[PDB]
Amino acid sequence: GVVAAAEKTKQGVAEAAGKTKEGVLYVGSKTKEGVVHGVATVAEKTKEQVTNVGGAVVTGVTAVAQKTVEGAGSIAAATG
Amino acid sequence: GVVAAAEKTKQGVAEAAGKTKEGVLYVGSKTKEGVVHGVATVAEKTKEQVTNVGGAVVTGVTAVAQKTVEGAGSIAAATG
Amino acid sequence: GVVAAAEKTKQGVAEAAGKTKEGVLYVGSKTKEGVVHGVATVAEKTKEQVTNVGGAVVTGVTAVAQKTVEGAGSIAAATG
Amino acid sequence: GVVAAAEKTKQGVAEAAGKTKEGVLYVGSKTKEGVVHGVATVAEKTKEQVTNVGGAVVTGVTAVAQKTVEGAGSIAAATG
Amino acid sequence: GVVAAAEKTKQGVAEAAGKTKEGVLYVGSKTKEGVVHGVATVAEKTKEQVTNVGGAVVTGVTAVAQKTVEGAGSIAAATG
Amino acid sequence: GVVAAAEKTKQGVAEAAGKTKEGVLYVGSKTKEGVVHGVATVAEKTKEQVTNVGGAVVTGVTAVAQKTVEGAGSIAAATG
Amino acid sequence: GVVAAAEKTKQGVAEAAGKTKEGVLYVGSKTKEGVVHGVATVAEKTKEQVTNVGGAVVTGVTAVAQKTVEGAGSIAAATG
Amino acid sequence: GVVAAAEKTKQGVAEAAGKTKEGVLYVGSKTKEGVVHGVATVAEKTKEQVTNVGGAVVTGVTAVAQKTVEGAGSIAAATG
Amino acid sequence: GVVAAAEKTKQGVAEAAGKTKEGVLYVGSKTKEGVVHGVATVAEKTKEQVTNVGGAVVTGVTAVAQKTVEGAGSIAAATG
Amino acid sequence: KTKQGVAEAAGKTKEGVLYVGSKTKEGVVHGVATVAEKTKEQVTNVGGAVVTGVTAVAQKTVEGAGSIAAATGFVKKDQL
Amino acid sequence: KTKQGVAEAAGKTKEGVLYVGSKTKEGVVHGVATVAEKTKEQVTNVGGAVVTGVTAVAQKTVEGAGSIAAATGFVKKDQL
Amino acid sequence: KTKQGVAEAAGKTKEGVLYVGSKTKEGVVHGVATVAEKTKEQVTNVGGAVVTGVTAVAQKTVEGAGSIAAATGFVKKDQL
Amino acid sequence: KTKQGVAEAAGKTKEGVLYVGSKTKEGVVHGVATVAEKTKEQVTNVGGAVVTGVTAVAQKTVEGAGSIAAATGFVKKDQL
Amino acid sequence: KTKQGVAEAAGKTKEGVLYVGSKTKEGVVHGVATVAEKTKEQVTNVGGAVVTGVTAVAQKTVEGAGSIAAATGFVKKDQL
Amino acid sequence: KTKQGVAEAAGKTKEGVLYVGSKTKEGVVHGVATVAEKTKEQVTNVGGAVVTGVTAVAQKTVEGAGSIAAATGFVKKDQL
Amino acid sequence: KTKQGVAEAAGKTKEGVLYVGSKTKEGVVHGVATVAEKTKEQVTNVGGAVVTGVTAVAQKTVEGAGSIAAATGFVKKDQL
Amino acid sequence: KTKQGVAEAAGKTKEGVLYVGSKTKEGVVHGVATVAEKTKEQVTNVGGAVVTGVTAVAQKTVEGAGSIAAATGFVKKDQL
Amino acid sequence: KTKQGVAEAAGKTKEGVLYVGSKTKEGVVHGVATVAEKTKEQVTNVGGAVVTGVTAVAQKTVEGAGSIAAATGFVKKDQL
């Protein structure tokens, strides 16, 4: 039982609410989720080698922002 | 039982709400999910090699923003 | 039971709502999901080699923004 | 039971709503999903080689924005 | 049971709604899904080679915006 | 049961709606799905070679905006 | 049961609707699905070669906007 | 049961509708589906070669806007 | 059961509709489906060669707007 | 000498294709698109002006002191 | 000499493709798109001005002292 | 000499593709998009001005002392 | 000499692709997007000005002493 | 000499791709986006000015002594 | 000589890609986004000014002594 | 000589990619985002000024003695 | 000579990637974000000024003796 | 000579990546974020000034003797 009342008033406001659930709000904000910024490499000879024979390999520069709900959020998964 | 009332008022507002669920709102914000920004490479000889023989390989510069709901959110998956 | 009432008022507003669910709203915002920005490479000799023999390979510069619902959101999948 | 009422009012508004579900709305916003912006390469000799023998290979500059619902959202899939 | 009423009013509005589901709306917004913008390559000798023998290969500059519903949204698929 | 009523009013509007489902609407917006914009290549000798022997190959500059519903939305598919 | 009523009113409007489903509408908007814009190539010698022996090959500058409903939306398909 | 009524009104409108399904409408909009715009090539010697021996090859500058309903929407199909 | 009524009115309109399905309408809009616009080539020697031996080849500048309903919408098909 | 509102162009070439264009727009109204769907309008006017339609007016004048382009919806009762 | 509102261009080439363009817009209204769907409007006017429509006016004047482009929706009762 | 509001361009090339463009906009209104959906408006005016529509006015004047572009929705009762 | 509001460009090349552009905007209104959904407005005016619509005005003037661009929604009762 | 509000650019190259651009904006209003959803407004005006809409005004003037861009929502009752 | 508000750029290259840009903004309003959801406003005005909307004004003036950009919502009752 | 508010840039290269940019902002308002959700406002004004909306004003002036940008919400009753 | 408010840059390279940028901001308002949720405001004004909204003003002036940027919410009753 | 408010940069390299930047901010307001949630405000004003909103003002002046940036919420009753 929720009741609000206003009467005999020049400017009256009556506001009622049974159940309320506030939510997220960003005002003038900034965010950085999974960011790579400013990587420099000065070599003479570079060499990479990957010899995957049935798994999962993730190399190089990476930036991930997974947001899964009802499952594995792996980056490199390998099941058998 | 939710009740609001206004009467005998020059300017009256009555507002009622049983159940309310607020939601997300961005006002003047910025976001960065899965971003690669400013990568520099100054070499003389470069060499890459990938010899995948039945798996999953992900290389180079990468930027992912997966948002799955009811499944695996892998980047490199390898099942058998 | 949700009730709102206004009476004997010059300017009256009565507003009622049983159940309400607010939603997302962006006002003057910016977003960046899965972005690659500013990659520079100054070499003399470059060489890439991929010898996939039955899997999944993803190379080079990449920018993905998957939003799947009821399935795997892999980037490089390899099942057997 | 949702009721709104206005009476004996010069300017009256009565508004009722049983169930309401708000929706997404962008006002003056910008978005960037799966974007590659500003890639520069200054070499002398370049060489690429791909020798796929029955899988999936994705190379070069890529920008994807998959939005699948009831299926795998892979970029390079390889089943057998 | 949803009821709205206005009476004895110079300017009256009564509006009722059982169930309502709001929808997406863009007002003065911009979007970028799967975009490649500003790629420059200054070499002297370039060479590409692809020797696919029964799979799927996707190379070069790419920009995809798949929006499938009830099927795989791969970019390079290879089944057998 | 949805009811709206107006009476004894100089200007009255009564509007009722059982079930309503709003829809998408773009007002003064811009979109970019699957776009390649501003690619420059300054070489001296260029050479491409493709030797597909029974699969699917997609090369060069590409820009796709698939919107399938009940089928695979691949770019390069190869089944057997 | 949906009812709207107006009576004893100088200007009255009564509007009722059982079920309503709004639809898409673009007002003063612009779209770009599958677009290639501004590609420049300044070489001295160019050479392309394609030796397809029973698959599907798609090269050059491409811009596709497939919108299939009940079938594969591939760009290069190869079945056997 | 949908009912609207107006009576004892100088200007009355009664409008009823059982089921309604709105449709797409473009007002002052522009669209670009499958467009190639602004491709320039300044070489000295150019050479193309295609040696298809029983598949499908699509080269050169291309711009497609397929809208199939109950069939494959491939660009280069090759079945056997 | 859909009913509308007007009576005792100087200007009355009664309009009823059981089921309604709105349709597409373009007002002051422009469209571009499958368009090639502004291709320039400044070489000294050009040479093309096609040696199809039983498949389908499509080259040169192309602009297609297929709209099939119950069949494959390929550009280059090759069955056997 | 004096130049106002002048669009000028020039072009020289020895061999090749040439295009020169010069367009000028002064006092031009272009593209006024309007839709009214299922709209109710009720007007009662007594000795006044009511405007509800679409009015597109363009004017260009040289030596036009005291010019008026569009005077819409007004009541003028000057004594002198 | 004097230049106001001038768009000028020039171009020289010996061999190749050339494009020169010069456009000028002065006092131009472009692209006024408006939609009103299921809208109710009720106006009672007594000796005044009411404007509800769309008014797009463009004007260009040389030597236009005291110019007015659009005077919309006004009541003028000057004594002198 | 004097330059105001001037857009100027120039270009030289010996071999290749050339593009030169020069555009100028002065007193230009571009892109006014408006939607009103399920909106109720009720106006009672007695000897005044009410404006609710869309008014897009553009003006350019040379030697325009005392110029007015848009005077919308006003009541002028000057004695002299 | 004197330069105000001037956009100037230049470009030289011997071989290759060239682009030169120069744009100027002076007194320009671009992109005014507005939506009103399920909005109730009730106005009673007696000898005044009420403005609720959209007013986009752009003006450019040379030698414009005493210029006014947009005078919206006002009551002027000057004695002299 | 004198330079005010000038955007200038230059570029030289022997071989390769070149881009030169110069843009200027003076007195420009860009991107005014507004939404009002389920909003109630009630106004009673007696001899005054009420403004509730959207007013986007841009102005540029040379030699504009005493210029006014936008005078919105005011009551002027000067004696002299 | 004198430089005010000048954006200048220059660039030289022998071989490769070049980009030169110069932009200037003076008296510019960019990006005014506003939303009002489920908002109640009630105004009673008697001989005054009330402003509740959105007012975006931009102005640029040369030799503008005594300039005013935006005078919004005021009551002026000067004796002289 | 004299430099005020000048953005200048320069760049030299022999081989490779080059970018030169120069931007200037003077009297610029950028990004004013505002939201009002479920807000109640009640105003009673008698011969005064009330301001509740959004006012974004930008101004740039050369030789502007006595300039005013934004005078909002005021009551001026000067005797002389 | 004299330098005020100057942003200057320079860059030299023989081979590789180069970036040069120069930006200047003078009298600039950037990013004013505001939210009001479930807020009640009640104002009674009698011959005064009340300000509750958002006011973003930016100004730049050269030779501006006696300049005022923003005079908000004031009562001026000067005798002389 | 004289330098005030100057941002200067320089850079030299023979091979590799280079970045040069120079930014200047003078009289700049950046990032004013404000939230009011479930706030009650009640104001009664009689011949005064009340300010409750957000006021972001930025100003830059050269030769500005006697300049004022923001005069907010004041009562001025000077005799002379």
Residue numbers in the entry:
A (entry chain M), B (entry chain K), C (entry chain S), D (entry chain Q), E (entry chain W), F (entry chain U), ...: 14 to 93
J (entry chain P), K (entry chain Z), L (entry chain b), M (entry chain V), N (entry chain X), O (entry chain R), ...: 21 to 100
Article excerpt on this structure:
Multiple system atrophy (MSA) is a progressive neurodegenerative disease characterized by accumulation of α‐synuclein cross‐β amyloid filaments in the brain. Previous structural studies of these filaments by cryo‐electron microscopy (cryo‐EM) revealed three discrete folds distinct from α‐synuclein filaments associated with other neurodegenerative diseases. The 3.3‐Å resolution structure of the Type I2 filament reveals a fold consisting of two asymmetric protofilaments, one of which adopts a novel structure that is chimeric between two previously reported protofilaments. These results further define MSA‐specific folds of α‐synuclein filaments and have implications for designing MSA diagnostics and therapeutics.
Here, we use cryo‐EM to identify a novel, low‐populated MSA filament subtype (designated Type I2) in addition to a predominant class comprising MSA Type II2 filaments.
